Every structure is written in structure tokens, then in C-alpha cells.
Ligand binder design. Structure first.
Ligand SMILES: *[C@H](O)[C@H](C[C@@H]1CCNC1=O)NC(=O)[C@H](CC(C)C)NC(=O)OCC1CCC(F)(F)CC1
Ligand SMILES: *[C@H](O)[C@H](C[C@@H]1CCNC1=O)NC(=O)[C@H](CC(C)C)NC(=O)OCC1CCC(F)(F)CC1
Lengths: 300, 299
């Protein structure tokens, strides 16, 4: 029985209609056009010269509205401001296809969709999980900066990521729309070290519930570890603190298996499945959220 | 690794999705110009679903028997049946119709799916048409009429319309010429599904991806020719390998010949013996040569 658990993205049409190309002097990258505002990474101001230590405050003061051109794929720039690692440009036409939206900062273990773009043209979409060291996997080439990540609630888009960087191990990071870089990385072309990754406990738990729902509950036992005992165990064993949610509780009702029983299962499975499989895997999986499992397996 | 399950942006296709209702049944349709395509079992009452007479159902229908709703409503002015699909004609041409073709895909080909419910796009993912003509993905009740598609240039190729779930939880559907992949039938009955196989050309692509990422411990000078590997594939659950320009480009860039990777595959099939390739301990066959070119090179 194939599970039905797949990496699934939100439809990107609403976001595709907001993607533009932003150019400053020699550099070009993507931006997000919402109403009369265009968002993009501030390193579009940096010339290839000074990328290893740009003075962004200095670059900004050196700019005029005429320093920027936004091309859609006719937008005069009439304002420019900097917000953390982002530019907040103002243009004289409101995007007619602006969706309803909010901004959020995702937390580790949450998933979102990314629309990868090059020169203002959407080219691909995929789903990522914000890792406990605040990097993401995904696929991003040169020219992808300014690609955006988002979730959907209703037909409301929650914008949460704007792409900035590749890290040393090949993972990626970017800004939230308040200007802050996920993981405190600097938007400078300087070697930087990401922290060690961990297993997202709550996603692992959702995945075992997915397993149970699929008729694989061989790992379930009456044994229970409390959330508190687990969370102390987790410090020493490369797991995140478990945090319960309504979404997880609904999987426990549906299956009749308590979160504490799966916390115990994780302590045992973490040393290996000992020859057994779960959902065709020999390792614990943590890139499926409880929402994914409710939505994809129970249509909730 | 840099190699991920990546779908085509779905906006061009969202604009074409509608809901089609016929009596009790409701599902999704595809609205292109003055035509709305949908699975013909929208005509079947729940009761008669195990062996419908689609020919008799269609003659009993009038144009008012189909209701079509966008998320406006669209007046049906013609109805016809093409294999397992209905071809409805509506009096409004979809003003956001993309340039499109209807090409049937072959095993090993990957395409994007836009999963919809009651005419509303709700998710997108990428699947591989397996050698037994099934796909995986995620399809719940209400998902029939969801479409699979690729985009080459400005042109969308529509290649799949969702019809059913098999007993093992895989899925299958129609091409837009009205044929069902794998000649499954659009009847609610247990059906014999052929045995799966590894898609050899996709395994080669993935090995090239490994090479491109600095993981080449498995490459030897030894070679196995295409014809020899294909005789072996018959006995070991692999598809015939057929090269393409896209694979040739991976060979050019890495300097590793196809034939070296076919030898490697014959040896890696018995076990990696404690090694990993791109984080994996089994052969991966769900990424195409085109995927590897695009995601690791930009072609
Ligand atoms: C913008 O399009 C581009 C996207 C990356 C290119 C390859 N993959 C990408 O995601 N962003 C950059 O090139 C940044 C620009 C700086 C001003 C932030 N730099 C960068 O991505 O590479 C330098 C890395 C090297 C690895 C590291 F971990 F050490 C950190 C710096
Ligand atoms: C249309 O929305 C629906 C989609 C499936 C519902 C569950 N997952 C799906 O992808 N398709 C159907 O309901 C078909 C209708 C027929 C007229 C084709 N039937 C179906 O998919 O389920 C019945 C299967 C169950 C397993 C089996 F081996 F017995 C074969 C029949």
C-alpha cells in the first residue's frame, strides 16, 4: 500500500502574478510586486566589486529612485527604503493582480512552498521544511535571489521567505519580510558556518501517525514517555523539543494512539528499526508536518 | 544534493480548472477555449458504477444535463464522448487559455499534477509515469478530472486526467486522446496491475547527478553496452535504456559515458554494501535527465 504522503506545494498562480525583475546598475534579480510596493534583496545594489563586504547603508544613500528599474513579465520607482536585508521599493502602478496576503516568520519544522524564479520568470515550484538550523534545502541556481516562499490559508497567501543565499553545505537561506535573515546569516559573500541540524520531533510524530493510518503500527506499544521526559532526552540526542498542536491531537483521536506512545517509539526507533520498515523507509522522516498528514491522508 | 521534486508553476493551468456536475456526481474539468474536458463517469450514478453503459448514459443526456462552474457559470451547448473523456462545448471561450498540445507520455516521463477539488486547485506535485502505467501522488475523493501537464517553451502539454485509484493505492488516468494509460478501464472494479520496473534512463540521470555533485566512487572504467544492458534489463526488472540528447549532455559535461553507468547499475542493483549515493542507499529512478540538466546546470 503506497501511503499517499507526498511533497505537495500550494498552487503558485497567485504568486506568479506578483513576480517582477528588479535591476540596479549591473545586478538583476527577482522581486515581489504587491500593490504599490516591490520587495527585493538589498544586495541588488552591490556591484560585483564589493560583494565580500558591502556597506549597505552607504550604497542606499548613494541611490536615487532612477537607480532602480522594475520590469514586469511600466513601473517607475518613486520610493526606496531598506528594511533589514530587503529593499522596499515604491512604484507608481499598483499590481492589479495582488492577492490577499499577510507576512509571517516561519519556525523550524514548518513547511512552505517556494516559487523559484530567474529574471522575473517563474520556472519551478517545490516545498521545503525550515530546518532547526534555519536553512532550507530546495533547488536554487544563480539568478534565483528574490524568489519567494509562502503558505496559503483560505485564498490568503502568507509570505514568509525571500531567497538570499546558498550555504557551505549546499542548503539555503533567505529573509522574512520584516528584513531579518533566517538563522542570523549575513547577506555578504563570506564563508559562514551553519549549525548542526536536528530531527523535527513533531513532524516525526506526524509521520508515525501517517504510518498507523496506513496500517503500519508494529512500533506501537503501551509504553509512554511524557513530553517533558522526551524533551530532556531530545537535548542529548539531536531532536527538537516536542510541541503539541491541535493538528497532532486530531491524529491521536483518529488513530487512538497517544502522543506519549509515539514519543517512546521514537526513543526506540532512533537507534534503528532493526530490520523493519515504516512507509518504505529505514530511517525516521521529519519533512511531513501534522497538517500534511491530516490534509493528505484524511482530507482534513 | 540540489536535486528535488520540482513542479512547473501551475498558474497557467489553474486558470483553466472548472467544476462539472451531472446529477449526483461532481468532479473537475479542464476548460480550453470553447471546450471543457472531464472524465465521462461524471455521468454514472453511484449505483451503476461497477459496470456502466457509457454509450447509453451519453444518449440520455442533453446539454442541460451538465452544469459547469468556474472558481462564473458556463452554458453547455454541445456534448460528445471521446474514449473515457467527455468533450463538452460551452458558449464562452476561456480567455486565459494557454498554448497547448495533447501528447501522451511514456513510462519514465515526469509531469506536474494540479490536484483539484470542486473545481478549486488545492495542491501541486510531480509524478513519474511508471512502467506499469500507474502514478503515485496524492488524490482523494473528489479529485477526478485533476490534470497532469508539462511545459516546453510557451506550450503546455496536457498529458493526464485523473480517473481512479488502484488497489495498492497508486493512481491512473486518461490521456487527452481519451485513452486510459495502461488500458485500465473506467469501472469501479479490482483490476490486474502489471509489475513495476526501474526506469533505467532515470537511474543513469541520477548517477550523473551524483557525479556532478562530487560523488563518483561507483564509476569504474568497465562498461556494459546498451544492447547488452537491455538484454540484462529484461531479466532484472529494468526498462530498456534509450538514450536522448538530454542524457548525452550529462555524458559530455562529466566525461563519464552512459556505458560506464550501465555497468555501474548492474553492480549497484545487488546492493550498495554500506555506501550511499546522494544520501540514498537504493537506486533512484524518479528524476529524469531533463530534471538533472535543469536543476544542476540550468538547461
Ligand atoms: C542570488 O541569486 C544568489 C543565489 C545563490 C547562487 C547559487 N545558489 C544560490 O542560492 N545569492 C548569492 O549568490 C549570495 C550573495 C551574497 C551577497 C549573500 N552569495 C552566495 O550565495 O554564495 C556565497 C556563500 C558560500 C557558502 C557559504 F556558506 F560559505 C556562505 C556564502
Ligand atoms: C474520482 O474522483 C475518483 C478518485 C479516487 C477516489 C479515491 N482516490 C482516488 O484517486 N475515482 C473513482 O472514484 C473511481 C471511479 C471509477 C468509475 C473509475 N474508482 C476508484 O478509484 O476507486 C475504486 C478502486 C478501489 C481499489 C480496487 F482495486 F478495487 C479498484 C477499484
Amino acid at each position: 500500500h503506497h501511503s499517499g504522503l507526498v511533497k505537495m506545494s500550494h498552487p503558485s498562480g497567485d504568486v506568479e502574478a506578483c513576480m517582477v525583475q528588479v535591476t540596479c546598475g549591473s545586478m538583476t534579480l527577482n522581486g515581489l510586486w504587491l500593490d504599490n510596493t516591490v520587495w527585493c534583496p538589498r544586495h541588488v545594489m552591490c556591484p560585483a566589486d564589493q560583494l565580500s563586504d558591502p556597506n549597505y547603508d552607504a550604497l542606499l544613500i548613494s541611490m536615487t529612485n532612477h537607480s532602480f528599474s522594475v520590469q514586469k513579465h511600466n513601473l517607475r520607482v518613486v520610493g526606496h527604503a531598506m528594511q533589514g536585508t530587503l529593499l522596499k521599493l515604491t512604484v507608481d502602478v499598483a499590481n492589479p493582480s495582488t492577492p490577499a496576503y499577510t507576512f509571517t516568520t516561519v519556525k523550524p519544522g514548518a513547511a512552505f512552498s517556494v516559487l523559484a524564479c530567474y529574471n522575473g520568470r517563474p520556472t519551478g515550484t517545490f516545498t521545503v521544511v525550515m530546518r532547526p538550523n534555519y536553512t532550507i534545502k530546495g533547488s536554487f541556481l544563480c539568478g534565483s535571489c528574490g524568489s519567494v516562499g509562502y503558505t496559503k490559508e483560505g485564498s490568503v497567501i502568507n509570505f514568509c521567505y525571500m531567497h538570499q543565499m546558498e550555504l557551505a553545505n549546499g542548503t539555503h537561506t533567505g529573509s522574512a519580510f520584516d528584513g531579518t535573515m533566517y538563522g542570523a546569516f549575513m547577506d555578504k559573500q563570506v564563508h559562514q558556518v551553519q549549525l548542526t541540524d536536528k530531527y523535527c520531533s513533531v513532524n516525526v510524530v506526524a509521520w508515525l501517525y501517517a504510518a498507523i493510518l496506513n496500517g503500519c503500527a508494529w512500533f506501537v506499544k503501551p509504553n509512554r514517555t511524557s513530553v517533558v521526559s522526551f524533551n530532556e532526552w531530545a537535548l542529548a540526542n539531536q531532536f527538537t523539543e516536542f510541541v503539541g498542536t491541535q493538528s497532532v491531537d486530531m491524529l491521536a483521536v483518529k488513530t487512538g494512539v497517544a502522543i506519549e506512545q509515539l514519543l517512546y517509539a521514537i526513543q526506540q526507533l532512533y537507534t534503528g528499526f532493526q530490520g523493519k520498515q515504516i512507509l518504505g523507509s529505514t530511517m525516521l522522516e521529519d519533512e511531513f508536518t501534522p497538517e500534511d498528514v491530516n490534509m493528505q491522508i484524511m482530507g482534513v
